[PDB]
Design a protein around this ligand. Structure first.
Ligand code: MG
Lengths: 210, 346, 211
DNA sequence: TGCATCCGTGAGTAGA
DNA sequence: TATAATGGGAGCACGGATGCA
């Protein structure tokens, strides 16, 4: 009934009262120190549904990744607005990124073993330990690393470099390590003798990155 | 301006889940309920109470209300007591609390995600006597039942299991609320069955079936009388405001008399009845006439048993009845001479 | 972990885990608080700056927010949010009407009555008439909101049997039926912990039923 | 200050 | 109580009073 009596008392227009009573917009009964768009929440302020959800429950967004693609950022990493979350995905807001349903679990298994390598005295640079990518030796000339034991070759190839395990019968008689710059001259399941070249190490050879 | 459009807009604010999300929420819900059972085994409290407290903390300060099922009233003081009672548990026992919380949250998100299905199911049920939004709400109840009863172990999409409960709820609603005079659900099923049967019969025969033909197509146990009584009991009342003329001038309810309240003629009839009955009752000895009135409740408005009506004036038993008749004998005298009582006998 | 034990993935030996190719990525505005030992808050709790989160009170919250406890990632994450009380409908309106001090508003409007602008004096008058009406009458504004809806006596909304043995009734019975049904459904929905959307819609329907 | 919006009015009796 | 199903459908005339541009 115009003018609205309730609307008149609370100083609200017809539209506002309609929106509040009929569950269009929210009316603030207390700020609790809320801030919206840089200006603090005033009591008796009309909030939309989006505004109320953002204020009360916070702001977040989910970005779908095309199946078969990997993320350019890690899990739990702080993200800036405009920073690409993927090759085809751009994040609209700032905050913490979280992985939703990883389709692939890559487990890196820790392996600590004992291997051996035969090298010329001159080429080898003496060091108590060797970091990945650090030069193990520098060769003046092509050099072949021969087998010191007879047996069956087991070739285990990593990303770069390899482990060659020689075994007679069911018991391994030898374990050899071939660093970067060393090309295996044998294949998997090959029979070799003492003094037969296993691999050729030429030029400057260093520890693999892995 | 339009409630349905507004609700449909509020529905489109929640994005639909995916398979992994659905299975995730379902898993969190089930493991949440299991966690509640675990906390029940540990703390020694009521599973319902714990569930309602966890739910109270999830929903927040916005909603607190007493549940009819709980033995104790639910108030923020109590929810704080029980919450702090749950947080006092060791880490391994405190894990189930977090599990239950995330479980309830997952339940809320799961129900909120499926709200479209309820609408798509309820849109087919329009015209049964219930409003669209009513059907949507009952269907929402069905969806809630579905969420609480769902098992992700069976590798079934949630829509499959939910649809059944939604249809169930919608149907129960339609059967329950559509009639001004309430009829039980089974009887409603019977009436609907009768309707479909009669519709098939008129469909094949090319004319409106009789009670006998309906009795035949209904099988054994059904005769014409039962069909007639069932159709009679299936009749819906009509509105008193139903238009009579060509204008808004008159209503149906203006043509219905009130049979309850006594007309002035009836009131005067009863009054004069008491008058003439008091006129001819003083003609003879007082105590026996007053014993007659004592039996017929003119005095106290109650029929007194022979021992009581006896014990009234100091007599007892067998005499009293023989006096009443005696009174009724002498009562046959006076009136018969003045003949005043004829017309009141109708 | 999976449904069937044979499809589960169990680590053969010692190693580190790396998650790749996620279904999606969820960006949230929040604060991450990794905890080593034990957390004193649970999911759903609300937290102001300076409140103890985990580790016996070593790690606390920087900002206002809602608590999400991640057991998998072993971190207490606080989503930035406020405790704001913002309501809808006749509940909120009734609250506002209850909070009103009529004498104060009368004073304010009286001060407004001295403004040089004609329109402002007009509006101030129109409001002050209502305010003073409530003041003189002794009526409270919050009574314009109904907690309890009266029911008209059945003889003024009769269910009667006509000549033919059929029934005639008043439409007020149907309206009352709608109101009662929606109210009961609302109460059940509240007791069963329905989501905000459902309850909201139900309340709207209730309001329109009373309408 | 004037244009424009919503809202609320529009004979009686009889009969049907 | 279990394939999956996920956003509806209809439908003149002049006045006072207030709201807005
Ligand atoms: Mg039969």
């Amino acid at each position: 009934d115009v003018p609205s009596k309730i609307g008149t008392l609370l100083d609200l227009s017809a539209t506002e009262l309609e929106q509040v009573l009929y569950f269009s917009k929210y009316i603030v009964l207390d700020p609790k120190g809320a801030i919206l768009n840089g200006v603090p929440v005033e009591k008796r302020q009309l909030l939309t549904d989006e505004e109320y959800r953002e204020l009360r429950y916070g702001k977040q967004e989910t970005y779908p990744l095309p199946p078969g693609v990997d993320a350019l950022v890690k899990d739990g990493e702080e993200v800036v607005k405009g920073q690409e979350l993927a090759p085809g995905v751009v994040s609209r807001l700032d905050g913490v990124a979280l992985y939703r349903f990883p389709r692939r679990v890559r487990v890196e298994y820790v392996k600590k073993e004992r291997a051996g390598l035969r090298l010329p005295l001159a080429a080898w640079v003496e060091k108590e330990a060797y970091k990945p990518g650090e030069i193990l030796a520098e060769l003046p000339e092509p050099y072949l690393f021969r087998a010191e034991e007879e047996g069956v070759v087991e070739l285990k190839e990593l990303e770069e470099g390899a482990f060659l395990v020689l075994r007679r019968e069911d018991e391994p008689v030898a374990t050899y390590f071939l660093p970067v710059g060393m090309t295996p001259l044998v294949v998997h399941g090959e029979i070799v003798e003492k003094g037969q070249p296993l691999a050729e190490a030429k030029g400057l050879l260093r520890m693999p990155r892995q | 301006s339009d409630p349905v459009r507004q609700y449909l807009h509020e529905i489109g604010q929640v994005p639909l889940l995916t398979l992994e999300e659905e299975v995730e929420l379902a898993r969190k819900v089930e493991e949440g309920m299991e966690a509640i059972k675990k906390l029940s085994e540990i703390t020694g409290l009521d599973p319902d109470l714990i569930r309602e407290v966890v739910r109270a903390k999830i929903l927040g300060s916005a909603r607190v209300r007493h549940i009819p099922g709980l033995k104790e009233t639910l108030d923020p003081k109590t929810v704080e007591e029980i919450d702090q009672k749950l947080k006092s548990l060791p880490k391994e026992h405190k894990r189930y609390l977090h599990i239950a919380r995330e479980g309830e949250a997952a339940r809320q998100h799961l129900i909120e995600a499926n709200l479209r299905l309820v609408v798509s199911i309820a849109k087919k049920y329009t015209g049964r006597g219930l409003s669209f939004l009513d059907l949507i709400q009952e269907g929402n109840q069905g969806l809630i039942r579905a969420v609480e009863k769902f098992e992700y172990k069976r590798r079934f999409k949630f829509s499959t299991y939910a649809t059944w409960w939604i249809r169930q709820a919608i149907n129960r609603a339609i059967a329950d609320q559509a009639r001004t005079i309430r009829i039980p659900v089974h009887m409603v099923e019977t009436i609907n069955k009768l309707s479909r049967t009669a519709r098939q019969l008129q469909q094949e025969l090319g004319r409106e079936p009789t009670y006998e033909e309906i009795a035949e197509a209904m099988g054994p146990g059904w005769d014409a009388k039962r069909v007639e009584e069932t159709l009679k009991i299936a009749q819906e009342p009509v509105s008193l405001e139903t238009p009579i003329g060509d204008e808004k001038d008159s209503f149906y309810g203006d043509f219905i008399p009130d049979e309850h309240l006594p007309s002035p003629v009836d009131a005067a009839t009863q009054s004069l009845l008491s008058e003439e009955l008091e006129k001819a009752l003083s003609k003879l000895s007082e105590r026996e006439a007053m014993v007659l009135k004592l039996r017929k409740g003119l005095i106290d408005g109650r029929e007194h048993t022979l021992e009581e009506v006896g014990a009234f004036f100091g007599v007892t038993r067998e005499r009293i009845r023989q006096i009443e008749n005696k009174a009724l004998r002498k009562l046959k005298y006076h009136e018969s001479r003045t003949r005043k009582l004829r017309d009141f006998l109708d | 972990a999976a449904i069937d034990p044979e499809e589960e993935v169990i680590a053969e030996a010692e190693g580190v885990v790396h998650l790749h190719e996620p279904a999606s990525i969820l960006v949230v505005k929040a604060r991450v608080y990794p905890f080593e030992d034990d957390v004193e808050v649970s999911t759903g709790d609300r937290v102001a700056p300076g409140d103890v989160l985990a580790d016996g009170g070593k790690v606390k919250s920087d900002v206002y927010g809602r608590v999400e406890v991640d057991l998998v990632r072993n971190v207490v994450r606080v989503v930035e949010s406020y405790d704001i009380d913002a309501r809808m409908g006749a509940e909120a309106i009734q609250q506002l009407l209850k909070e009103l001090d009529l004498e104060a508003l009368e004073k304010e409007l009286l001060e407004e009555m001295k403004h040089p602008s004609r329109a402002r004096r007009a509006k101030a008058r129109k409001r002050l008439e209502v305010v003073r009406a409530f003041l003189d009458s002794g009526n409270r504004p919050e009574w314009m909101i109904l907690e309890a809806v009266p029911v008209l006596p059945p003889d003024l909304r009769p269910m009667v049997q006509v000549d033919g043995g059929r029934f005639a009734t008043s439409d007020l019975n149907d309206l009352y039926r709608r109101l009662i049904n929606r109210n009961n459904r609302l109460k059940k929905l509240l007791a069963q912990g329905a989501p905000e959307i459902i309850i909201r819609n139900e309340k709207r329907m209730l309001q329109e039923a009373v309408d």
